[PDB]
């Protein structure tokens, strides 16, 4: 599915995303637009090597989640096909257990680039939703 911006701050505001890994609400919020879009179905592949990435954070399968190609593990437990889905929830526990190594947000490229040095201040303004 789709969410849009304020849908997806009350859904992780709803599971204590909003102080998490002493990053705000709207950090987490900018990550999700920039590395999926807020849509649950976004995958990546990239044959380097088997790497890719899956769904709303796009959690790349060769740390955090285990599927059939070589450059799988499993840290989350959980199948990536788990992160295909219209439930975030685990999700939501392979975001939380991922900030907490010492890369912290950068390990998301497109949070990186795109909402670390950015004014987040007035980002959900208009959602106290």
């Known amino acids: 599915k ?3 911006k304020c849908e997806l701050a009350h859904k992780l505001k709803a599971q204590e995303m909003d102080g998490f890994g002493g990053y705000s609400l709207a950090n987490w919020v900018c990550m999700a637009e920039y590395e999926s879009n807020f849509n649950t179905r976004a995958f990546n592949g990239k044959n380097a090597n088997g790497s890719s990435d899956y769904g709303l954070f796009q959690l790349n399968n060769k740390w955090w ?3 059939n190609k070589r450059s799988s593990s499993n840290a989350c437990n959980i199948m ?8 975030i929830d685990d999700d939501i526990s392979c975001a939380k257990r991922v900030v907490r190594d010492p890369k912290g947000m950068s390990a998301w490229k497109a949070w990186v680039k795109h909402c670390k040095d950015k004014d987040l201040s007035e980002y ?5 939703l």
Request: with cysteine; hydrophobic share 30%.
């Open 2 to 4: 789709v969410f849009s």
């Open 65 to 67: 989640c285990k599927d």
């Open 80 to 87: 990536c096909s788990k992160l295909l889905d219209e439930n």
């Open 124 to 128: 959900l303004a208009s959602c106290n």
